[PDB]
Design an enzyme around this catalytic site. Structure first.
Site, short mmCIF file in Angstrom:
data_model
loop_
_atom_site.label_atom_id
_atom_site.label_comp_id
_atom_site.label_asym_id
_atom_site.label_seq_id
_atom_site.Cartn_x
_atom_site.Cartn_y
_atom_site.Cartn_z
N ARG A 118 18.74 4.30 25.54
CA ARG A 118 17.45 4.48 24.88
C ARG A 118 16.43 3.60 25.62
NH1 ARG A 118 16.93 2.98 18.53
NH2 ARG A 118 17.41 0.94 19.53
N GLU A 119 15.29 4.17 25.99
CA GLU A 119 14.30 3.45 26.73
C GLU A 119 13.95 2.16 26.03
OE1 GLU A 119 11.08 5.69 29.35
OE2 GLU A 119 10.05 4.81 27.57
N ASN A 177 18.69 -8.78 13.50
CA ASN A 177 18.82 -7.38 13.04
C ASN A 177 19.24 -7.30 11.59
OD1 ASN A 177 19.01 -7.27 15.97
ND2 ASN A 177 18.95 -5.08 15.56
N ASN A 233 15.78 5.34 12.70
CA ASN A 233 15.66 4.87 14.06
C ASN A 233 16.64 3.72 14.41
OD1 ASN A 233 13.91 2.24 14.05
ND2 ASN A 233 13.54 3.08 16.14
N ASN A 275 5.19 2.52 3.44
CA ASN A 275 6.60 2.73 3.72
C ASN A 275 7.44 2.27 2.55
OD1 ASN A 275 8.80 3.60 5.34
ND2 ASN A 275 9.17 1.48 6.02
N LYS A 285 3.75 -8.74 17.52
CA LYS A 285 4.38 -9.89 16.89
C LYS A 285 4.10 -11.20 17.64
CE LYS A 285 6.28 -8.19 13.04
NZ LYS A 285 5.77 -8.63 11.74
N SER A 333 9.96 -11.59 14.96
CA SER A 333 11.15 -10.87 15.39
C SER A 333 11.71 -11.37 16.70
CB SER A 333 10.65 -9.49 15.71
OG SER A 333 11.65 -8.73 16.37
N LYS A 392 6.35 -1.13 11.40
CA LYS A 392 7.47 -1.56 12.21
C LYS A 392 7.78 -0.57 13.25
CE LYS A 392 11.17 -0.99 8.98
NZ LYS A 392 12.44 -1.52 8.47
N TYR A 448 4.66 -2.90 19.43
CA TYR A 448 5.13 -3.55 18.23
C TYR A 448 5.52 -4.99 18.49
CZ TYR A 448 8.33 -5.26 14.63
OH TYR A 448 8.95 -6.03 13.68
N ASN A 506 0.78 -1.21 0.00
CA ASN A 506 0.00 0.00 0.00
C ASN A 506 0.82 1.26 0.00
OD1 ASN A 506 0.95 0.21 2.59
ND2 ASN A 506 -1.12 0.31 3.55
N1 LIG Z 1 13.57 -4.41 9.68
C1 LIG Z 1 13.71 -5.08 10.83
O1 LIG Z 1 14.69 -4.87 11.55
C2 LIG Z 1 12.68 -6.13 11.25
C3 LIG Z 1 12.94 -6.85 12.46
C4 LIG Z 1 11.97 -7.82 12.79
C5 LIG Z 1 10.86 -8.13 12.07
N2 LIG Z 1 10.68 -7.32 10.95
C6 LIG Z 1 9.40 -7.42 10.23
O2 LIG Z 1 9.66 -7.81 8.93
C7 LIG Z 1 8.64 -7.25 8.04
C8 LIG Z 1 9.34 -6.43 6.96
O3 LIG Z 1 10.20 -5.47 7.60
P1 LIG Z 1 10.87 -4.39 6.64
O4 LIG Z 1 12.12 -3.98 7.32
O5 LIG Z 1 11.04 -4.90 5.29
O6 LIG Z 1 9.87 -3.13 6.67
P2 LIG Z 1 9.20 -2.26 5.52
O7 LIG Z 1 8.44 -1.20 6.14
O8 LIG Z 1 10.26 -1.86 4.54
O9 LIG Z 1 8.29 -3.34 4.75
C9 LIG Z 1 6.89 -3.48 5.08
C10 LIG Z 1 6.10 -3.18 3.81
O10 LIG Z 1 4.70 -3.37 4.14
C11 LIG Z 1 3.95 -2.38 3.51
N3 LIG Z 1 2.72 -2.21 4.29
C12 LIG Z 1 2.54 -1.67 5.52
N4 LIG Z 1 1.27 -1.67 5.94
C13 LIG Z 1 0.60 -2.26 4.88
C14 LIG Z 1 -0.80 -2.56 4.70
N5 LIG Z 1 -1.72 -2.21 5.58
N6 LIG Z 1 -1.12 -3.17 3.53
C15 LIG Z 1 -0.14 -3.45 2.61
N7 LIG Z 1 1.15 -3.20 2.70
C16 LIG Z 1 1.45 -2.61 3.87
C17 LIG Z 1 4.85 -1.14 3.59
O11 LIG Z 1 4.46 -0.15 2.62
C18 LIG Z 1 6.23 -1.72 3.31
O12 LIG Z 1 6.62 -1.69 1.93
C19 LIG Z 1 7.68 -6.48 8.92
O13 LIG Z 1 6.54 -7.25 9.34
C20 LIG Z 1 8.61 -6.14 10.09
O14 LIG Z 1 7.83 -5.83 11.27
C21 LIG Z 1 11.57 -6.39 10.47
O1 LIG Z 2 21.08 5.83 16.52
C1 LIG Z 2 21.26 4.73 17.03
C2 LIG Z 2 20.56 3.52 16.76
C3 LIG Z 2 20.84 2.41 17.42
N1 LIG Z 2 21.83 2.37 18.40
C4 LIG Z 2 22.14 1.10 19.09
O2 LIG Z 2 22.34 0.12 18.11
C5 LIG Z 2 21.80 -1.16 18.50
C6 LIG Z 2 20.82 -1.66 17.44
O3 LIG Z 2 19.73 -0.70 17.48
P1 LIG Z 2 18.52 -0.80 16.44
O4 LIG Z 2 17.56 0.28 16.77
O5 LIG Z 2 19.01 -0.85 15.06
O6 LIG Z 2 17.86 -2.28 16.70
P2 LIG Z 2 17.28 -2.96 18.01
O7 LIG Z 2 17.89 -4.32 18.02
O8 LIG Z 2 17.74 -2.28 19.27
O9 LIG Z 2 15.68 -3.15 17.94
C7 LIG Z 2 14.98 -2.21 18.69
O10 LIG Z 2 14.97 -1.01 17.94
C8 LIG Z 2 14.49 -1.26 16.62
C9 LIG Z 2 14.82 0.03 15.92
O11 LIG Z 2 14.45 1.08 16.82
C10 LIG Z 2 12.99 -1.51 16.74
O12 LIG Z 2 12.39 -0.38 17.37
C11 LIG Z 2 12.79 -2.78 17.56
O13 LIG Z 2 11.41 -2.89 17.90
C12 LIG Z 2 13.56 -2.70 18.87
O14 LIG Z 2 13.55 -3.99 19.49
C13 LIG Z 2 21.20 -0.95 19.87
O15 LIG Z 2 22.10 -1.40 20.90
C14 LIG Z 2 20.98 0.57 19.90
O16 LIG Z 2 21.03 1.04 21.25
C15 LIG Z 2 22.55 3.48 18.71
O17 LIG Z 2 23.41 3.49 19.57
N2 LIG Z 2 22.24 4.61 18.02
#
Ligand SMILES: NC(=O)c1ccc[n+]([C@@H]2O[C@H](COP(=O)([O-])OP(=O)(O)OC[C@H]3O[C@@H](n4cnc5c(N)ncnc54)[C@H](O)[C@@H]3O)[C@@H](O)[C@H]2O)c1
Ligand SMILES: O=c1ccn([C@@H]2O[C@H](COP(=O)(O)OP(=O)(O)O[C@H]3O[C@H](CO)[C@H](O)[C@H](O)[C@H]3O)[C@@H](O)[C@H]2O)c(=O)[nH]1
Ligand SMILES: NC(=O)c1ccc[n+]([C@@H]2O[C@H](COP(=O)([O-])OP(=O)(O)OC[C@H]3O[C@@H](n4cnc5c(N)ncnc54)[C@H](O)[C@@H]3O)[C@@H](O)[C@H]2O)c1
Ligand SMILES: O=c1ccn([C@@H]2O[C@H](COP(=O)(O)OP(=O)(O)O[C@H]3O[C@H](CO)[C@H](O)[C@H](O)[C@H]3O)[C@@H](O)[C@H]2O)c(=O)[nH]1
Ligand SMILES: [Cl-]
Ligand SMILES: [Cl-]
Ligand SMILES: [Cl-]
Ligand SMILES: [Mg+2]
Lengths: 345, 347
Positions: A299-300, A186, A205, A36, A160, A131, A91, A156, A33
C-alpha cells in the site's frame, strides 16, 4: 475551573476516554459535530449514550463544530473549564492525500481556533491527540520521542506535525501554558463490556476492523498489503495498543498538566510490535472463526515496521499499557460479535 | 477580460507589484485591511493612489480582511479571477516569537481560507509570497531551491514553510492547480519615480529603512546588530534585491502559471550578498551624507550570511534581477528624500 472539555468525544478514542474520565471522578463536557460519529435515538451520540449507561453517570454534551467561533465562544462562556482534551479532527482514512484542504481546514484551522479561544478564556491546559506518523519513515526502532519528526508522507500526518510545532511555539511564548502531546501508535480493542468500540462506516481502512469484519463474515477475506518487507514474516509490523490503556494515558496526561509541566511529548504505545499475520492469527483464536487472507501489493506510503519506545511515558507520565494481544483481540471480537452493524443503521 | 486578485496589495511589495501589473496590461483587483498600510485621503491607500497617478490607470480596490469569509466569498463571486497573487500576511517586527497565534491565524488560517475560496470559485492559479527564511540557518551557500526547508526559528518562518507544504500537497492531489511559490530574499529600494517605497510605522525593524532614516537625519546613528559573525567584516550578509525587480518577478510568475506549470518554487534574489557595513557605505555614497552607527549586541535568531542561487529563476521563470546595489541605494534615497516622513494624505 472544574470541567474538562473533550473535543471529538463521541469518536472511538474520545468515547473510551469520556468513560475513563467519568469513572475517575472527572466531569467532562463533550463536543462533536457527528462527522464520524453515530447519532443515537436522543441527544447524545450512541457511543456516549452507552457510556452513560455503562458508568451510571451523566454525559454533558453539546453538538457543535470546532470551526464555529461563535459556538466556541458560547461554550467557553457557559462552562468553566480547567483543561481541554482535543480529539476532534479528520483522520487519515487513506483520504488525506486526495483532499488536503479538508484536512488542513479541520485539523489546522480548527485546532488554531480552539487554541485561540482557550487563550482568550485563560484555559491554558491541553492534551492533544498526536500520532506516531509524525516520526515519518522510521530511522531506527523502537521509536523514542527523540527520533526526528516532520517530513511526513501525508497531509494527515503533516497536519499532526504542524499542530505539534504550533503548540511548542505557543508554550515557548507563554510559559503559563501546559500541553501534553500524545503520540498514539495503533489503537485497537474496545471497552470490556463489548458495548462500545470502533464504528467505521464503509470498507475499513485500518487492519483490525477489517480483520474483525472478515471474521464476522461481513468481508470475504483480508487483503494483506505486501509480504515482502524486512520484517520477520514479510508483513507490516505495528505497535497495537488497547484503546482502554490509551484512554487511561489521557488521565495520566491530565495529572501531568497539574505539575505545570509546560510542553511535554509522550509516545502512547506498548513497545511490542506485531505483524499482520500475527494479528490475523490472534483474531482467529479470539473469535473461533477462520479469517481467510490474500497477499496483495504494498500500500502506497506504508512503512515496514513501527513500534514505540515506551520508556519516557512510563518514567514521566507514570503510565504503561497493561493489556496484551490476547486481551485486545478478545475485546475487539466481543464488540464486533455483539454489534454486527456497529452502533446502528 | 479576467482579473488578477492581489491580496495585501497596499503594502511595500504589493504596491510595487500592482504598478508592474498595470504597466504590463493586467487588470488587478486589490484587497488590503490596512494592517500595515497607510490610509490615503480617499478610499484608496495612499500607495495605490500614487500608483494610479504614476500609471494613469485605475486601481480597483476593496478594503477587506482575508480572514473575512463572507467578504472574500462575495469578491470571488463578483469577479472572474484568472489568478491570485497573495501578499497579505503578518511579517515580523521581531514579534512572531512572542505572538505565535497571530502568525498562525493570519498567515496559516488566512491562506487556508483563501485556498478554499479559490477552489470553490474555480480559481486554481496562485502566486504566493514565500521567503528565504524557510531555509532556516543555511547549511550551505548559496541557497538553492534544493536546500532543506523547515527547521525555521520563528513562528513567522514556520508559517511560511507550513503554507508552502500545504500548497505542494494541494498541487500533488489536484493536477489542475498551478502555483508559483516565490522565496524572496531581502527586498529593498523603491520605484524610480521616488513616489512610493517602504513605509514603516515607528522604529524600523529592518536594515535599509533604518539606514535611510539616519541618512535623512531622523535617527542619530545606525545600531549594528553584532559584528562578530563569521563573515568578511563580521557583520551579517544578505542578498538585497531591488523591489522593482522583485515585483517584475511576479509578472514572470503569472506567465509561468499560464504554462499549466503545476507547483513551482523559485528563489527571488540577485545571488550577491552584501554586509551591513557595505550597505551603510553604499547609502553614504547615494545620499552624499555620512551615516554613523554603533555596534550593539546580536539580534536573537539572526543568521550570519544568507544569499541566493538565482539560476533556477533565470532559467525557468525567464527572469533576472537587473538592478544593482547603487540603483537600490539611489532609489531608496530618492523616496526617502522626497518623502521624509513616508506617506501622508494629499495636502
Ligand atoms: N485511530 C487512530 O489510529 C489514530 C492514530 C493516531 C492519532 N489519532 C487521532 O486521535 C484522534 C481521535 O481518533 P479516533 O480514532 O477516535 O477518530 P474518530 O473519528 O472516531 O474521532 C474523532 C471525532 O471528532 C469528531 N469531529 C471531526 N471533525 C470535527 C469538527 N470539525 N468539530 C467537532 N468534532 C469533530 C468526529 O465526529 C469524531 O467523533 C484524532 O485526532 C485522530 O487523528 C487516531
Ligand atoms: O486491509 C488492510 C489494512 C491494513 N493492513 C496492514 O496492517 C498494518 C496496519 O495498517 P493500518 O492501516 O491499520 O495502520 P497504519 O499503522 O499503517 O497507519 C497508516 O494507515 C492508517 C490507516 O490507513 C492511517 O491512514 C495512518 O495515517 C497511516 O500512517 C499495515 O502494515 C498495513 O499494511 C493490511 O495488510 N490490510
Ligand atoms: N519585506 C520582506 O523583506 C519580505 C521577505 C520575505 C517574504 N515577504 C512576504 O511578502 C509579503 C509582502 O511583504 P511586504 O514587505 O510588502 O509587507 P507589507 O506589510 O508592506 O505588506 C503586506 C500587506 O498585507 C496587509 N495585510 C496584513 N494582514 C492582512 C489581512 N489579514 N488581510 C488583508 N491584508 C492584510 C498589510 O496591511 C500590508 O499592506 C508578506 O507576506 C511578507 O511576509 C516579505
Ligand atoms: O537595525 C538593524 C537592522 C538590521 N541589522 C542587520 O542587517 C541585516 C538585515 O537585517 P533585516 O532585519 O533587514 O533582514 P533579515 O533578512 O535579517 O531578517 C531578520 O529580520 C527580519 C526583519 O528584521 C525578521 O526579524 C527575520 O525573522 C530575521 O531573520 C541583518 O544582518 C541584521 O542583523 C542591523 O544591524 N541593524
Ligand atoms: Cl482539497
Ligand atoms: Cl506502555
Ligand atoms: Cl499567541
Ligand atoms: Mg542553477
Amino acid at each position: 475551573a472544574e470541567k474538562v472539555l473533550v473535543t471529538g468525544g463521541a469518536g472511538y478514542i474520545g468515547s473510551h476516554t469520556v468513560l475513563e474520565l467519568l469513572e475517575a471522578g472527572y466531569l467532562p463536557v463533550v463536543i462533536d459535530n457527528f462527522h464520524n460519529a453515530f447519532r443515537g435515538g436522543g441527544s447524545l451520540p450512541e457511543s456516549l449514550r452507552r457510556v452513560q449507561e455503562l458508568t451510571g453517570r451523566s454525559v454533558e454534551f453539546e453538538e457543535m463544530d470546532i470551526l464555529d467561533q461563535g459556538a466556541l465562544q458560547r461554550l467557553f462562556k457557559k462552562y468553566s473549564f480547567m483543561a481541554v482534551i482535543h480529539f476532534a479532527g479528520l483522520k487519515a482514512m487513506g483520504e488525506s492525500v486526495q483532499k488536503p484542504l479538508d484536512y488542513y481546514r479541520v485539523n489546522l484551522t480548527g485546532t488554531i481556533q480552539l487554541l485561540e479561544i482557550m487563550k482568550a478564556h485563560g484555559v491554558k491546559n491541553l492534551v492533544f491527540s498526536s500520532s506516531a506518523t509524525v516520526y515519518g519513515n522510521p530511522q531506527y526502532l523502537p521509536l523514542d520521542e527523540a527520533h526526528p519528526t516532520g517530513g511526513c508522507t501525508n497531509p494527515y500526518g503533516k497536519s499532526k506535525f504542524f499542530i505539534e510545532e504550533m503548540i511548542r511555539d505557543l508554550c515557548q511564548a507563554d510559559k503559563t501554558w501546559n500541553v501534553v502531546l500524545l503520540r498514539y501508535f495503533n489503537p485497537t480493542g474496545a471497552h470490556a463490556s463489548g458495548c462500545i468500540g470502533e464504528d467505521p462506516q464503509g470498507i475499513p481502512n485500518n487492519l483490525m476492523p477489517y480483520v474483525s469484519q472478515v471474521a464476522i463474515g461481513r468481508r470475504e477475506a483480508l487483503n494483506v498489503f505486501g509480504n515482502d518487507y524486512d520484517t520477520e514474516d514479510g508483513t507490516g509490523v505495528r505497535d497495537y495498543i488497547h484503546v482502554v490503556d490509551l484512554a487511561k494515558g489521557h488521565i495520566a496526561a491530565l495529572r501531568k498538566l497539574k505539575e505545570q509541566c509546560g510542553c511535554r511529548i509522550y509516545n502512547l504505545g506498548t513497545g511490542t510490535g506485531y505483524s499482520v499475520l500475527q494479528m490475523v492469527q490472534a483474531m482467529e483464536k479470539a473469535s473461533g472463526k477462520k479469517i481467510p487472507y490474500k497477499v496483495v501489493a504494498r500500500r502506497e506510503g506504508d512503512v515496514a515496521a513501527c513500534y514505540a519506545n515506551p520508556s519516557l511515558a512510563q518514567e514521566e507520565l507514570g503510565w504503561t499499557a497493561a493489556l496484551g494481544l490476547d486481551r485486545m483481540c478478545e475485546d475487539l471480537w466481543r464488540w464486533q460479535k455483539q454489534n454486527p452493524s456497529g452502533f446502528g443503521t
